[PDB]
Amino acid sequence: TTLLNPYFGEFGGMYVPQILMPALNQLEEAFVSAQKDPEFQAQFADLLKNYAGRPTALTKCQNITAGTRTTLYLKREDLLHGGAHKTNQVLGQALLAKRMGKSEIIAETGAGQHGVASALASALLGLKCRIYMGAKDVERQSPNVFRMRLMGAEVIPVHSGSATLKDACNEALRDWSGSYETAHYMLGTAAGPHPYPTIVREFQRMIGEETKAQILDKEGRLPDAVIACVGGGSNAIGMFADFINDTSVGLIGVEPGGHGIETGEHGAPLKHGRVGIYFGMKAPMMQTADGQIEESYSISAGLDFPSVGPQHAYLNSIGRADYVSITDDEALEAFKTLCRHEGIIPALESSHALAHALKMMREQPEKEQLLVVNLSGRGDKDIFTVHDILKARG
Amino acid sequence: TTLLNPYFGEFGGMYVPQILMPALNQLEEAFVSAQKDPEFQAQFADLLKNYAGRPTALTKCQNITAGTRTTLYLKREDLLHGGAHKTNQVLGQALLAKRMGKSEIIAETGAGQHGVASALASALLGLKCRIYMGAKDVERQSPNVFRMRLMGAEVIPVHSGSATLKDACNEALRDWSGSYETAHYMLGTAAGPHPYPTIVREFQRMIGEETKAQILDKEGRLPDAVIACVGGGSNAIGMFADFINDTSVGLIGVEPGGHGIETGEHGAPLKHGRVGIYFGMKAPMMQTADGQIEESYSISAGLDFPSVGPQHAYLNSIGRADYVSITDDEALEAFKTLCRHEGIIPALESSHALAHALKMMREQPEKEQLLVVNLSGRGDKDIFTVHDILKARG
Amino acid sequence: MERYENLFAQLNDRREGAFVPFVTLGDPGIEQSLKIIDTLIDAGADALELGVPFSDPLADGPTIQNANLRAFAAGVTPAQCFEMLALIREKHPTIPIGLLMYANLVFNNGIDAFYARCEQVGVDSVLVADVPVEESAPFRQAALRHNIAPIFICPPNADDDLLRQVASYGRGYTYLLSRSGVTGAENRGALPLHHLIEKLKEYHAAPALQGFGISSPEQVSAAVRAGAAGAISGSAIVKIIEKNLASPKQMLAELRSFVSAMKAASR
Amino acid sequence: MERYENLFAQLNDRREGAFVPFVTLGDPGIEQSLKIIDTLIDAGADALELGVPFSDPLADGPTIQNANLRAFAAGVTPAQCFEMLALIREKHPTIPIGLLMYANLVFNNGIDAFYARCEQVGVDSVLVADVPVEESAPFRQAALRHNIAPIFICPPNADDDLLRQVASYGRGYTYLLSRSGVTGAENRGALPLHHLIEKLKEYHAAPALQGFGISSPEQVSAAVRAGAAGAISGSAIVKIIEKNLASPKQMLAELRSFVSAMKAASR
């Protein structure tokens, strides 16, 4: 059996070949042990504070909300070392790998941010890192591939299937199925087989814990809602977790609507896909009517996970969290608005969450509401993309 | 006369056309007033903490120093909003501009970082920003030019002279000579006419104040030396200032040696130039035997100031600080070493300071020494440069 | 039906092990795949393991990843696979037919409906590669309701509790893994499997068929000598298809020679 | 010498203002610049203001930035400028000659040595554009030791203390700025300068010459009517050089016509 529940309602589970079950049980046991170990907790806290730069600021955006009754704060994960929230959990998973005595790390990456975060944690902590990346992604993410290699990681292109993220996910699991005795699979989001959705949430929950302390200090009350983009689910569940039991706080997840839900070119499986079993879990996914797995489309490469974490599917099902979508054009407008009015360049992933908050404000400008958007990362990496688009249009 | 001394020994002064003296006297008076105003101090502190992300971490680098008696800490200005230390002082100068009632900002930039920092401070604080940049620099810094424009700043190419930083410095002063009644000139380094060297140091001194508190907390004593790169002098004087009266603490500034001092292709005027009068100050500069002003060469565009702040020339002259140089190849090796061993990508400017610390360690590996390197910025911006070089070599 | 039970009883009477080839349905096309399968049977296959093309075969090495890619290039769908399966059973009434599935294809239109379709076309067993015993309940229940044998993989890293579960839950045959990793002829399992084989017999498990890395006759004889009821070969068979795509006739001749040699080794 | 004093005394006797053109030495080349200067004198210039080419002329607009660029293209150095200056004085013994310098060129090989070289070639005054009265002590001291008049700019944004200092420290002539900003014919000063002119006379300052934006005869007559001793025109003169680079003869003819008209307006 297991020490912790592998399911969130009907979602989740451990759908991996039998040969990998001992690796998952070992990981779960090490995680449960580490969470009770004050020494592990102190080492993790020391890396987060003195290496990654936590706590991250909570920035009030008065220029954006001028003329409305919305007060908007941005949780600044864009200021974390590496430029996105992913750094929090790769530091925790690298410490777990060492606790289990593993010396090698396997990771998958799509847009490259998780690959960079896994390579920097592995370089700092003395682990040999290999990263699988679909060959179409390797081609469009040359900068990130070079960063990984400067940090000593081996980057291995994956040409099978669609040669993108899901194919790299498969390859990582194929490798782990034969190398688990010496390697740990550092999964990049709050999805996959148990215990990963649970471990990644717990290693990202300081986002919401800090946000709660910071907003109480600055406003003397909890937010009316916290809003985060959802690619696979890690930054959002990290912001949501500490607020789940504060029933008055709305939890809003934003999936990419791409060119529009009605076009079918989107990445919004939670609200517009169908439940399936893939990547080790039962969860909503992008799939054909026959059951073949498809890609997620978005202007933002980082919202490319073709499924979603099971805890989000569960929180939706019971009505505790609400999920919406934002199109490419809405995300681009939010990106431009934050640069011009607050001097902050947001990641295009994060721009989806900001765009929904801007809609909440603009649609009901006289509604009094205290909102926090998780700014999951910085957007220097998206400057070329935005430039090319705006140029194509004029 | 003036309220504060415009000179550091023989260096400094106010060598501007008569028409600009009232603007400098007004600025000095506003600065002296602001430094005594608790409201100004609280507003500045609030922006530094909740917008820029201070305090920045102080990271210990055990992998780099393994096998030696050197303990090395990096002050993490690479984690400040914008990715470099420049953000500290543009927030203070933007508040000063508003204190004087000015509504417009003029700034010069070479590699583009000061232009980006001036544009983000102006976007946040409601100031109309125009930035002068030599046309050769505009050509090689397309990403930064686009960032400035996304933030609402007007970028104006300068084709006069060498079409690089010194020419943009000239143009900024020409503009200010006719627009000072409504515009404030947000100078980008601890140089230029008084009061700028003094204002920029005071608006960057939290770097060294935080470093002193952090090292006392972690090591229970002051560093043996603090090391910083010197382009114009701001990050270094910001790290040095709070330690000037701690006589046991060495202050080491690192100028770019380019292809080698003996080649003449460098940017090390403090130790290898000749005193002159330019950019409003008497200071060491890169100049021909006839007195014409020349450019500074370095693999790092940000160490392009063809002179150096007068307080550094003074601290050198009395022996309180020591200045050295590091070549392009030494800076590139330090860049590669930090990426691989600590998972941190440093700016090539900062890599010059790191390279000198690595020499201090490697040349005398059994010398017990506690060193702090100011990591003035992050190096994502230098990934293409490094890639191109390493490729050219193989 | 009891096709596996009848086969193993007949094989034991002849002191023979089973040889079971695996191919991806529809690779390189529907008509050629049907011809490949008849050749495997005529050359001596005792049973068949047949893969339905899936977008993400995460337990498979490159050889079978490419077989799935070729079948997709041919437009092969799960509905076409069931039509192929009905035809194969209509031609060969007694040979056991097992499917190699991935969970999403079984769960897609309903687990119970999937196994009911298998019964309708005459399939005998189903191995769902990414469903461990721990998640197997709805799959094994539906299998048994529709007279399909649910197959479970017994890994080298197995323990007693897992052996008792595989013995209790499986039917038809027990899939004895040769090694960790993914499918592939270029990686031979070398761990002695004598102990597991004996514990499976002790717990009255369905007869063991060894699979993964089996590509030569001596491995078939070694598996039977260690106590397994037979051996499965997939990647070695599929490599013959891949190598002979441009020559359909030579492809069938080479498959015949290989299967014949592998089956001879089981005697 | 007392060349400025002699000129102003002679001009006052004729109820005339001075007209003083400015050019960059060596623009567009040494020989042509020498010809340009003789034409300016023959056409009626009462005195000359001459710029030494500098890499960073931060008080100058585009017209003069380009004059410095042309002189550098011709390889013009400060040593060549002093040779030109000696020749110009050898040809014209009484015309006042003032230099427009930037500090680094004066400080470069020693402030005292610079003014001593000026005395040797016969220069009468030096205006260092980026040296305000507050930093002027070593410059004005060296100037006076070598019989050179140190010139100071009296800005529109001036106050009484500055007026008293400019009056006390300057000699030869007082440079009365028409407006803020940098040099350029495309920007005319429109602030009435009657008050400053009167306060300068009250403090016995050297006679005022108005400069910046003066490009037409009516501005020369207006400056003298307001009480200034004369007017300086640089960018308007330099634009004639720039416009006629390909036609040296037409360039001299146009300079002659312009200077003649500007000088006539001072009468």
Ligand SMILES: O=P(O)(O)OC[C@@H](O)[C@@H](O)Nc1ccccc1O
């Ligand atoms: O290809 P190999 O190494 O000979 O191994 C035989 C397997 O392909 C075959 O049993 N089918 C099969 C079984 C379990 C998992 C994936 C699979 O494709």
Ligand SMILES: O=P(O)(O)OC[C@@H](O)[C@@H](O)Nc1ccccc1O
């Ligand atoms: O060019 P304009 O607008 O006619 O102004 C005249 C000035 O060029 C001339 O006095 N020289 C001069 C004087 C002060 C500063 C720079 C200078 O080039």
Ligand SMILES: *Cc1c(COP(=O)(O)O)cnc(C)c1O
């Ligand atoms: C990877 C990424 C995401 C999407 O992943 P989640 O697991 O859904 O958080 C979001 N924002 C940024 C900046 C990312 O790098």
Ligand SMILES: *Cc1c(COP(=O)(O)O)cnc(C)c1O
């Ligand atoms: C601009 C820059 C410098 C050089 O300027 P200083 O004024 O000398 O500090 C150094 N480091 C970084 C990262 C810079 O952006």
Ligand code: NA
């Ligand atoms: Na998704």
Ligand code: NA
């Ligand atoms: Na410099």
